[PDB]
Amino acid sequence: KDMVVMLLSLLEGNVVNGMIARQMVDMLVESSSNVEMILKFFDMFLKLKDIVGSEAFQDYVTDPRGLISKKDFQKAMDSQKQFTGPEIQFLLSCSEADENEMINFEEFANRFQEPARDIGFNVAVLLTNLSEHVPHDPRLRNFLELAESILEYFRPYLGRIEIMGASRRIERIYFEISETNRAQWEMPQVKESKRQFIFDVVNEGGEAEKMELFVSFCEDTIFEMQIAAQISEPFWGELEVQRVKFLNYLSRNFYTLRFLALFLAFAINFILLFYKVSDSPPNMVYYFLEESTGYMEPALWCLSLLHTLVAFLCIIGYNCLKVPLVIFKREKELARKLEFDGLYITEQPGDDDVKGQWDRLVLNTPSFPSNYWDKFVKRKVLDKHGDIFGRERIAELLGMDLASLEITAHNERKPDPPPGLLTWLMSIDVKYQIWKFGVIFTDNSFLYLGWYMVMSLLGHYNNFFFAAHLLDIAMGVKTLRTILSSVTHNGKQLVMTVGLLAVVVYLYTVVAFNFFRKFYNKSEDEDEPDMKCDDMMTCYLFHMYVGVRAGGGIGDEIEDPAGDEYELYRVVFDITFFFFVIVILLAIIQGLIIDAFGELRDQQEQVKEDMETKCFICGIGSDYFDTTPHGFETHTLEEHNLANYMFFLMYLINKDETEHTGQESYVWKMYQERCWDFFPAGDCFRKQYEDQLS
Amino acid sequence: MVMSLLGHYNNFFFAAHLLDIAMGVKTLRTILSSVTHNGKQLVMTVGLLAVVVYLYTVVAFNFFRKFYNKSEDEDEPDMKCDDMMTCYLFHMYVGVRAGGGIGDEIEDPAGDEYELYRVVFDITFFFFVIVILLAIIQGLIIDAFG
Amino acid sequence: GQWDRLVLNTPSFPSNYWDKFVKRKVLDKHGDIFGRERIAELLGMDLAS
Amino acid sequence: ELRDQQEQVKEDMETKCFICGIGSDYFDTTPHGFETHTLEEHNLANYM
Ligand SMILES: Nc1ncnc2c1ncn2[C@@H]1O[C@H](COP(=O)(O)OP(=O)(O)OP(=O)(O)O)[C@@H](O)[C@H]1O
Ligand SMILES: Nc1ncnc2c1ncn2[C@@H]1O[C@H](COP(=O)(O)OP(=O)(O)OP(=O)(O)O)[C@@H](O)[C@H]1O
Ligand SMILES: O=C(O)c1cnc2[nH]c(=O)[nH]c(=O)c2c1
Ligand SMILES: [Ca+2]
Ligand SMILES: [Zn+2]
Ligand SMILES: [Zn+2]
């Protein structure tokens, strides 16, 4: 593996048909027999593992212990036909035959897979790199054919990305992808967050800003993966372990709890449909359920209790699941503003931003960099902006003692923590806790869950308050959420046009009050008349209430003006009212809402179309790649996969800096400098090397 | 064929065969396919309309019961919101169909202590249900066709 | 796919479609790594026929 | 149509330089290329 790493290092910064790569191919050709022997070793052992996994082999073996005779083992593989006779003999030699000549295929298979994984992966990487950099050579293709099974086995782990290389030339980078990393990426909530992020950037992000947003999303996804790993599960102490198990179970089942709460609200409301009111008990009216069985009243009581309990459990699960992500994002953005921009040092917003003002409390606190990974951001901020405000000013701003960092740098001291409730009591930092509670209470999802719980308690007070929980299914479904968001998408225009409608109706009311008072009587009886325009407020309310709702306008409601001296002015008044208010303004308000709905749906479709048409990383359209069949599909799947970019970032984080290669170190330095020039921008490996490839 | 045999049983069952000309013509086939082109959205928005009408029914049942009498005769009254199921059916049946909303059907609240809340209730019903949600369902069908 | 399982055993499966030798081609393709007899019983062929 | 005219005017300003008429895409090859071109190289405020 070390030798192959040296060869790969020789291949760093190599162009297509490079002289280094050609010498490597010639050297492989000179040692072709030994290379084939190595590849045969790897492929035979991989095939042996798949065969001990194979049903035909399991049928061949008849021992209850699973031990197979050398003769039976031989006939089993020759039944599989993947191995030739000398290969079978060599496998028999490799297997440690006991005195009965019995063979344990499980240990015979897993004995060599673990040691050979690293070297096999490196060999696959080297062969892939050589094949892509020297595409025309037939000897390389032969070597690839022999290593076909190894390449197939390591394909899901082999990650490739292209970076904007150091030499101002596009380079392709090969790296390992962990099985755990891929498994966490395949998680449905991670996929949902990825979809949300993609929609947000493609809708309202510029290309230059989009790399920074993408890197921030990668960091948030890494933290979310850590949260998921922690919450996943394979006398103060026993109480504590039970409590953490309970919290983890709540966090894992948070969406299930939400759905159960929705179902409980539906059942409660269905029960409520049977409610009826009668003056007689089951001059004050009595509310009681009307059912023959009589089970429904206790059923409703238990259902309400269980619904409130489930709402409380949902709040706890949300605190254990999403609040860490919220705090992580806020701490990360605060740290970056503190260090790269010197926000509270240089900028010093004088109540410019409410979030910025709130963030002032946490800077002094010792526990500020807790949730976010960098615990040295305070020290970095000090080293950056100390000189031109002074060490002591930055120290008092960030709540550091200056001698503490020096003594920690000089040596490490470990204090023992007492396992006491009080010892945990002054362990708390009230300023950080207050800032965290403010951040949580400013969160829309937490506020929604709190309103849900409050409405559940109010439902315990009066059962009909449980009807408000039926609104949750609206925000649960994307179409209904878009419907709700449509009314606020054009909210300013809606408010202004409603105001204009009110103004025009007020003018019509003024005209009616001055002249057309007689027609506004709404009482048929001569003895008792009721007048709408005898009072200006009454007539204004009458107009806004009945005229706007009426299809023909106010003239439908008020009395016919036939045979009156004001008849022509009155018909003009009615017709103009019906034209301006019923037709134009109501149509405009309806149009605002409906066009908001349609515009949001078109935004969804446009985001999907843009993803299908352009590569998200390099920005080149699908048409250029599509000249080669499935060209865009391959480009997005292997060459420029954003999942591969995230995997590369995680791999860089886990890997040791001393172990970083040249390209890895270069990308790591750009990443810590927050410079995104390494991302390919309008350029591709196949675009840069198109002539040499062709 | 089954409908033809049922038409032999009763002649009016032959009326169902008139639907065949619809699927025969491309324009009518597109009209039929439009209602299913956005079927999931249609079902969800109809459910949301039912939910909002149910909330309005709950409010009316709790407070505005008196206005819901639909009998002019003093001796024999009939009540829609005396029972929650009855008032829900009354809403979904008459309020949605009415152009002005439920307030057109129910009795005028003039000179009542609940008059302002009731006019707010009627106006919001007419805005949310008659205008927005019905317009959205119509839009789903028509935009599917187009 | 579940419904199509019944027709594989039947002798008349390739009737309507033109290739009457698709069973034999499937056997020659995937016999070795399941065995001749397994593909034969799957497609309802006698091997000697 | 009037509202679409407003949006189209805004979009045209975002897409093309007001002085030279070259689209944003040519400048955008260099990062923030159009922003720099409109801010220093071809600022109509600078022309005034
Ligand atoms: N750089 C990129 N990396 C990955 N995917 C990209 C990139 N640029 C564009 N895409 C598009 O992103 C899409 C995401 O694929 P995915 O399968 O996860 O999506 P989906 O919403 O499940 O639908 P579908 O399977 O129809 O694409 C791909 O279809 C691809 O065309
Ligand atoms: N030659 C040009 N000179 C200046 N601005 C130009 C030119 N060509 C196009 N523009 C565009 O004019 C816009 C005017 O910028 P300004 O900040 O004044 O506008 P705004 O209406 O406040 O909105 P915004 O800040 O979102 O651009 C710029 O965003 C720029 O893209
Ligand atoms: O929390 C972690 O595992 C973690 C540790 N260190 C990190 N370093 C870095 O530069 N970026 C990260 O995203 C990161 C994450
Ligand atoms: Ca090194
Ligand atoms: Zn690309
Ligand atoms: Zn210009």
Coordinates of C-alpha atoms in Angstrom, one line a residue, chain A residues 83-450:
Chain A
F83 CA -12.3 -20.6 -10.5
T84 CA -10.2 -22.9 -12.6
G85 CA -8.6 -26.2 -11.4
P86 CA -5.2 -24.7 -10.4
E87 CA -7.1 -21.9 -8.6
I88 CA -9.1 -24.5 -6.7
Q89 CA -5.9 -26.3 -5.7
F90 CA -4.3 -23.0 -4.5
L91 CA -7.4 -22.2 -2.5
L92 CA -7.2 -25.7 -0.9
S93 CA -3.6 -25.0 0.0
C94 CA -4.5 -21.6 1.5
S95 CA -7.3 -23.1 3.6
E96 CA -6.0 -24.5 6.8
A97 CA -7.3 -28.1 6.5
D98 CA -7.9 -29.8 9.8
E99 CA -7.3 -33.5 10.5
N100 CA -10.6 -34.4 9.0
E101 CA -9.6 -32.2 6.0
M102 CA -12.7 -30.1 7.0
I103 CA -12.8 -26.5 5.9
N104 CA -14.6 -23.6 7.6
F105 CA -15.5 -21.3 4.7
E106 CA -16.5 -18.4 6.9
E107 CA -13.0 -17.9 8.4
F108 CA -11.4 -19.0 5.1
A109 CA -13.2 -16.1 3.5
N110 CA -12.9 -13.3 6.1
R111 CA -9.3 -14.2 7.0
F112 CA -7.8 -12.2 4.1
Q113 CA -10.4 -9.6 3.3
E114 CA -9.5 -7.2 6.1
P115 CA -5.7 -7.0 5.4
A116 CA -6.2 -6.7 1.7
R117 CA -8.8 -4.0 1.7
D118 CA -6.4 -1.0 1.7
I119 CA -4.0 -2.4 -0.9
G120 CA -6.9 -3.5 -3.1
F121 CA -8.5 0.0 -2.9
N122 CA -5.1 1.7 -3.7
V123 CA -4.6 -0.7 -6.7
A124 CA -8.1 0.1 -8.0
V125 CA -7.4 3.8 -7.6
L126 CA -4.1 3.5 -9.4
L127 CA -5.6 1.5 -12.3
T128 CA -8.5 4.0 -12.6
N129 CA -6.2 7.0 -12.6
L130 CA -3.9 5.4 -15.2
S131 CA -6.8 4.4 -17.4
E132 CA -8.3 7.9 -17.4
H133 CA -5.0 9.6 -18.0
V134 CA -3.8 7.2 -20.7
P135 CA -7.1 6.2 -22.4
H136 CA -5.7 4.8 -25.6
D137 CA -3.2 2.2 -24.5
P138 CA -4.5 -1.4 -25.0
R139 CA -2.1 -2.9 -22.3
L140 CA -3.8 -0.7 -19.7
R141 CA -7.2 -2.0 -20.9
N142 CA -6.0 -5.5 -20.5
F143 CA -4.9 -4.8 -16.9
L144 CA -8.3 -3.3 -16.3
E145 CA -10.0 -6.4 -17.6
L146 CA -8.1 -8.6 -15.2
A147 CA -8.9 -6.2 -12.3
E148 CA -12.6 -6.0 -13.3
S149 CA -13.9 -7.7 -10.1
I150 CA -11.7 -5.5 -7.9
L151 CA -12.8 -2.4 -9.6
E152 CA -16.5 -3.5 -9.3
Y153 CA -16.1 -4.2 -5.6
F154 CA -14.4 -0.9 -4.9
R155 CA -16.6 1.2 -7.2
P156 CA -19.1 2.3 -4.5
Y157 CA -16.2 3.4 -2.3
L158 CA -14.1 5.0 -5.0
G159 CA -14.9 8.7 -4.9
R160 CA -13.7 11.0 -7.7
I161 CA -14.0 14.8 -7.9
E162 CA -12.4 17.4 -10.2
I163 CA -10.8 20.5 -8.6
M164 CA -9.5 23.7 -10.1
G165 CA -5.9 22.6 -9.8
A166 CA -2.9 24.4 -8.5
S167 CA -1.3 24.7 -11.9
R168 CA -4.3 26.6 -13.3
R169 CA -5.3 23.3 -14.9
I170 CA -8.3 21.0 -14.1
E171 CA -7.3 17.9 -12.1
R172 CA -9.2 14.8 -11.1
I173 CA -8.9 13.6 -7.5
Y174 CA -9.5 10.0 -6.2
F175 CA -10.3 9.3 -2.6
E176 CA -12.0 6.8 -0.3
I177 CA -15.6 7.0 0.7
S178 CA -16.5 5.3 4.0
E179 CA -19.4 2.9 4.1
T180 CA -20.7 4.7 7.2
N181 CA -20.4 8.0 5.4
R182 CA -22.5 6.7 2.5
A183 CA -25.0 5.1 4.8
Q184 CA -25.5 8.4 6.7
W185 CA -25.8 10.2 3.3
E186 CA -28.5 7.8 2.2
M187 CA -30.7 8.6 5.3
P188 CA -34.1 10.1 4.4
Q189 CA -33.8 13.2 6.6
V190 CA -30.4 14.0 5.2
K191 CA -31.9 13.6 1.7
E192 CA -34.7 16.0 2.7
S193 CA -32.3 18.6 3.9
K194 CA -30.3 18.2 0.7
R195 CA -33.5 18.8 -1.3
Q196 CA -34.4 21.9 0.7
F197 CA -30.9 23.3 0.3
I198 CA -30.8 22.7 -3.4
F199 CA -34.2 24.4 -3.8
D200 CA -33.1 27.4 -1.8
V201 CA -29.8 27.9 -3.6
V202 CA -31.1 27.3 -7.1
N203 CA -34.0 29.7 -6.5
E204 CA -32.3 32.6 -4.6
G205 CA -28.5 32.1 -4.9
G206 CA -25.8 33.6 -7.1
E207 CA -23.1 31.3 -8.6
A208 CA -20.2 32.8 -6.6
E209 CA -22.2 32.8 -3.3
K210 CA -23.5 29.3 -4.1
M211 CA -20.1 27.6 -3.4
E212 CA -20.0 29.2 0.0
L213 CA -23.6 28.2 0.7
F214 CA -22.8 24.7 -0.5
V215 CA -19.8 24.4 1.9
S216 CA -21.9 25.7 4.8
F217 CA -24.6 23.1 3.9
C218 CA -21.9 20.4 3.9
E219 CA -20.8 21.4 7.4
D220 CA -24.3 21.4 8.7
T221 CA -24.9 18.0 7.1
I222 CA -21.8 16.6 8.8
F223 CA -23.1 17.9 12.2
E224 CA -26.5 16.4 11.4
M225 CA -24.8 13.1 10.7
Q226 CA -23.1 13.2 14.1
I227 CA -26.4 13.9 15.8
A228 CA -28.0 11.0 14.0
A229 CA -25.1 8.7 15.0
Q230 CA -25.5 9.7 18.6
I231 CA -29.2 9.3 18.7
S232 CA -29.0 5.9 17.1
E233 CA -28.9 3.2 19.7
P234 CA -27.3 -0.3 18.9
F235 CA -28.5 5.1 41.4
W236 CA -28.1 8.4 39.5
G237 CA -26.1 6.5 36.8
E238 CA -28.8 4.0 35.9
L239 CA -31.5 6.8 35.9
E240 CA -29.2 8.8 33.6
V241 CA -28.7 6.0 31.1
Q242 CA -32.5 5.3 31.1
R243 CA -33.1 9.0 30.6
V244 CA -30.7 9.2 27.6
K245 CA -32.3 6.1 26.1
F246 CA -35.7 7.8 26.5
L247 CA -34.4 11.0 24.8
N248 CA -32.8 9.1 22.0
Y249 CA -36.0 7.1 21.4
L250 CA -38.0 10.4 21.3
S251 CA -35.5 11.8 18.8
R252 CA -35.6 8.8 16.5
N253 CA -39.4 8.7 16.6
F254 CA -40.0 12.4 16.3
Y255 CA -41.8 12.3 12.9
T256 CA -43.8 9.2 14.0
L257 CA -44.9 11.2 17.1
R258 CA -45.9 14.1 14.9
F259 CA -48.0 11.8 12.7
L260 CA -49.5 10.2 15.8
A261 CA -50.5 13.7 17.0
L262 CA -52.1 14.5 13.7
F263 CA -54.0 11.2 13.8
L264 CA -55.2 11.8 17.4
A265 CA -56.4 15.3 16.4
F266 CA -58.4 13.8 13.5
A267 CA -59.9 11.2 15.8
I268 CA -60.8 13.8 18.4
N269 CA -62.5 16.0 15.8
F270 CA -64.4 13.0 14.3
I271 CA -65.7 12.3 17.8
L272 CA -66.6 16.0 18.1
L273 CA -68.7 15.8 15.0
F274 CA -71.4 14.0 17.1
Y275 CA -71.6 16.9 19.5
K276 CA -75.1 18.4 20.0
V277 CA -76.7 21.1 22.1
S278 CA -80.1 21.0 23.9
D279 CA -81.8 23.3 26.4
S280 CA -82.8 20.3 28.5
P281 CA -80.0 18.7 30.6
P282 CA -78.5 15.4 29.3
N283 CA -82.7 28.4 30.5
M284 CA -79.1 27.5 29.7
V285 CA -78.2 25.3 26.8
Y286 CA -76.3 22.0 27.5
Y287 CA -73.5 20.6 25.3
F288 CA -73.2 16.8 25.2
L289 CA -72.1 14.1 22.9
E290 CA -75.0 12.1 21.4
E291 CA -74.1 8.5 20.9
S292 CA -76.0 5.2 21.5
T293 CA -72.9 3.3 22.6
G294 CA -71.7 5.8 25.2
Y295 CA -68.0 4.8 24.7
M296 CA -67.3 8.1 22.9
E297 CA -67.1 10.4 25.9
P298 CA -64.4 8.3 27.8
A299 CA -62.7 7.7 24.4
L300 CA -62.5 11.5 23.8
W301 CA -61.2 12.1 27.3
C302 CA -58.4 9.5 27.0
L303 CA -57.7 10.7 23.4
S304 CA -57.3 14.3 24.6
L305 CA -54.9 13.3 27.4
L306 CA -52.8 11.1 25.0
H307 CA -52.7 14.0 22.5
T308 CA -51.4 16.4 25.0
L309 CA -48.8 13.9 26.1
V310 CA -47.8 13.3 22.5
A311 CA -47.4 17.0 21.9
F312 CA -45.1 17.3 25.0
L313 CA -43.1 14.4 23.7
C314 CA -42.8 16.1 20.3
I315 CA -41.5 19.2 21.9
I316 CA -38.9 17.2 23.8
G317 CA -37.9 15.3 20.7
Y318 CA -37.5 18.5 18.7
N319 CA -35.3 20.0 21.4
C320 CA -33.2 16.8 21.3
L321 CA -33.1 16.7 17.5
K322 CA -33.2 20.1 15.7
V323 CA -32.1 22.5 18.4
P324 CA -28.5 21.3 18.2
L325 CA -28.5 22.1 14.5
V326 CA -30.0 25.6 15.1
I327 CA -27.4 26.3 17.8
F328 CA -24.6 24.9 15.6
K329 CA -25.5 27.2 12.7
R330 CA -25.8 30.3 14.8
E331 CA -22.5 29.7 16.6
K332 CA -20.8 29.0 13.3
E333 CA -22.0 32.1 11.6
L334 CA -21.2 34.2 14.8
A335 CA -17.7 32.8 14.9
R336 CA -17.0 33.5 11.3
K337 CA -18.4 37.0 11.5
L338 CA -16.2 37.6 14.6
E339 CA -13.0 36.3 13.1
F340 CA -13.1 37.0 9.3
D341 CA -14.9 40.3 9.5
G342 CA -14.3 41.5 13.1
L343 CA -18.0 42.2 13.5
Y344 CA -18.0 43.1 17.2
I345 CA -14.5 44.5 17.0
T346 CA -14.4 46.6 13.8
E347 CA -17.9 46.8 12.6
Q348 CA -19.6 47.2 16.0
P349 CA -23.3 47.3 15.0
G350 CA -25.1 49.9 17.0
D351 CA -28.4 48.0 17.2
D352 CA -28.2 47.4 13.5
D353 CA -29.4 43.8 13.6
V354 CA -31.5 42.2 16.3
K355 CA -29.8 38.9 16.0
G356 CA -26.4 40.7 16.2
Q357 CA -27.6 42.5 19.4
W358 CA -28.7 39.2 20.9
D359 CA -25.4 37.5 20.1
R360 CA -23.6 40.0 22.4
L361 CA -24.4 38.0 25.5
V362 CA -22.8 34.8 24.4
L363 CA -19.3 36.3 23.6
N364 CA -18.4 36.7 27.2
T365 CA -19.6 33.3 28.1
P366 CA -17.1 30.4 28.5
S367 CA -19.3 28.0 26.7
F368 CA -19.9 29.9 23.5
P369 CA -18.0 27.7 21.1
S370 CA -19.6 24.6 22.6
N371 CA -22.0 23.3 19.9
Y372 CA -19.8 24.5 17.0
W373 CA -16.6 22.4 16.5
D374 CA -13.9 25.1 16.7
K375 CA -13.2 25.8 20.4
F376 CA -10.3 28.1 19.6
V377 CA -12.2 30.7 17.6
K378 CA -11.9 33.1 20.6
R379 CA -8.1 32.7 20.6
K380 CA -8.0 33.1 16.8
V381 CA -10.0 36.3 17.0
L382 CA -7.7 37.6 19.7
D383 CA -4.6 36.8 17.6
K384 CA -6.2 38.4 14.6
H385 CA -7.6 41.7 16.0
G386 CA -5.7 42.2 19.3
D387 CA -3.0 44.7 18.2
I388 CA -5.2 47.5 17.0
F389 CA -7.6 47.3 19.9
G390 CA -5.2 45.8 22.5
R391 CA -5.0 42.4 24.0
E392 CA -7.0 43.3 27.1
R393 CA -10.0 44.7 25.2
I394 CA -10.4 41.6 23.1
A395 CA -9.9 39.5 26.2
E396 CA -12.7 41.3 28.1
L397 CA -14.9 41.1 25.0
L398 CA -14.5 37.4 24.6
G399 CA -14.3 36.7 28.3
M400 CA -10.8 35.2 28.3
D401 CA -8.0 35.4 30.9
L402 CA -4.8 36.1 29.0
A403 CA -2.7 34.0 31.3
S404 CA -5.0 31.0 31.0
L405 CA -4.3 30.5 27.3
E406 CA -0.6 30.7 27.9
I407 CA -0.6 28.1 30.7
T408 CA -2.8 25.8 28.7
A409 CA -0.3 26.1 25.8
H410 CA 2.5 25.4 28.2
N411 CA 1.0 22.2 29.7
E412 CA -2.2 20.2 30.2
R413 CA -4.0 20.0 33.6
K414 CA -6.9 17.7 34.2
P415 CA -9.3 18.4 37.1
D416 CA -11.6 15.6 38.4
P417 CA -15.3 16.3 38.2
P418 CA -17.4 15.5 41.3
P419 CA -20.5 13.5 40.4
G420 CA -22.9 15.7 42.3
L421 CA -26.2 17.5 41.4
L422 CA -24.8 20.7 42.8
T423 CA -21.5 20.2 41.1
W424 CA -23.5 20.2 37.9
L425 CA -25.5 23.2 39.3
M426 CA -22.7 25.7 39.2
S427 CA -21.4 23.9 36.1
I428 CA -24.2 25.6 34.2
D429 CA -23.6 29.0 32.6
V430 CA -26.7 31.1 33.0
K431 CA -25.7 33.7 30.3
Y432 CA -25.2 31.0 27.7
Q433 CA -28.4 29.3 28.8
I434 CA -30.4 32.6 28.4
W435 CA -28.9 33.3 25.0
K436 CA -29.7 29.7 23.9
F437 CA -33.3 30.0 25.1
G438 CA -33.7 33.2 23.2
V439 CA -32.4 31.6 20.0
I440 CA -34.8 28.6 20.6
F441 CA -37.8 30.9 21.2
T442 CA -37.0 32.9 18.1
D443 CA -37.3 29.6 16.1
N444 CA -40.4 29.2 14.0
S445 CA -40.6 25.4 14.3
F446 CA -40.2 25.5 18.1
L447 CA -42.8 28.3 18.3
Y448 CA -45.2 26.1 16.2
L449 CA -44.7 23.1 18.5
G450 CA -45.2 25.4 21.6

